[PDB]
Amino acid sequence: DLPEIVASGDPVLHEKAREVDPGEIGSERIQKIIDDMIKVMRLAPCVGLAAPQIGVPLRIIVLEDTKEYISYAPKEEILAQERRHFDLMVMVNPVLKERSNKKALFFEGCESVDGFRAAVERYLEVVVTGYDRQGKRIEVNASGWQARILQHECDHLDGNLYVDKMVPRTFRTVDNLDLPLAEGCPKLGSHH
Ligand SMILES: [Zn+2]
Predict the structure, then answer these.
(1) Which among 12, 80, 94, 171 is most buried, taking Cβ atoms within 10 Å?
(2) How far apart are CA 23 and CA 169, in angstroms?
(3) Which reaction does it catalyse?
(4) Is 125 a catalytic residue?
C-alpha cells in the first residue's frame, strides 16, 4: 500500500527528522520507504520528495528532473533557472552546504502546500555529503535548479517549509502564477 503525501499542519512536517543509523540503510525496511518515495514522486509528478512528506520521520530525500517534465517549461525560463535533467538521486542523512554566497530567486511549490506558489531565494551552488541508497558515502556538488531542489528537500528534514522563507507579496495560487509582481518585489533571476 502506497503512502499518501502529508499536508501542511501535520506535525511530522514541522519537526526535525532523525538520522538513519547508517548500518540500517540496506535493510528491506529503509529500502521500502525509499521505493515508496520514489513511487509517490513519480506519481505526483514532482522533482523532489522528503521522508516527512510520506509520514516517515527520517533523514531521507529523493530527487529527479527529467527531460520530459522540462520540455513543458518556457525554453527561456529553463535557461534563467539553469534547470537541467539529472538521474534519480537518493540521499540518506544529507548534510547541505553552499559553495558561495550567490543566490537566485524563482517560484517554488511543495506537494504539502497544494495549489500555491511563491518566490524563494536559494543558494545557486551547493554541496551535499551523505549516503546513497546502498549505505555508501557520497558527496554531491549541485548548481541551478538541482541545488534548489536539494535545499527544498533538505529543509523538510529540519521541519522547515518554503512558506516560512518566501519573499513577501509573491505567494500565489498556481493559476495566478504568471501575474505580474507588485512594486518593491525583487525581480526573479540570479547574481552575475
Ligand atoms: Zn516540499
Answers:
(1) 94
(2) 46
(3) N-terminal N-formyl-L-methionyl-[peptide] + H2O = N-terminal L-methionyl-[peptide] + formate
(4) no
CB atoms within 10 A of CB 12: 16
Q: Which among 61, 176, 179, 51 has a CA at the least distance from the CA of 129?
A: 61
Q: How was this structure determined?
A: X-ray
Q: Report phi then psi at 99, rounded to 5.
A: -95, 0
Q: Are 115 and 22 in contact (CB under 8 A)?
A: no
Domain coverage including residue 167? 1-192
Residue the block writes with cell 533523514: 59
Q: Which residues contact 133 (CB under 8 A, 6 or more apart)?
A: 25, 31, 34, 90, 92
CATH, residue 160:
3.90.45.10
Q: How many domains does the structure of the chain reveal? A: 1
Rounded CA-CA distance 46/63 in Å is 8
Q: Please give the distance, rounded to the nearest whole angstrom, from the Cα atom of residue 69 to the centre of ligand 1.
A: 17
C-alpha 170 – ligand 1 centre gap (Å): 17
Answer whether 97's CB lies under 8 Å from 113's CB.
Answer: no
**Cα–Cα nearest to 127, from 94, 104, 101:** 94
Q: Which three cell numbers stand for residue 60?
A: 531521507
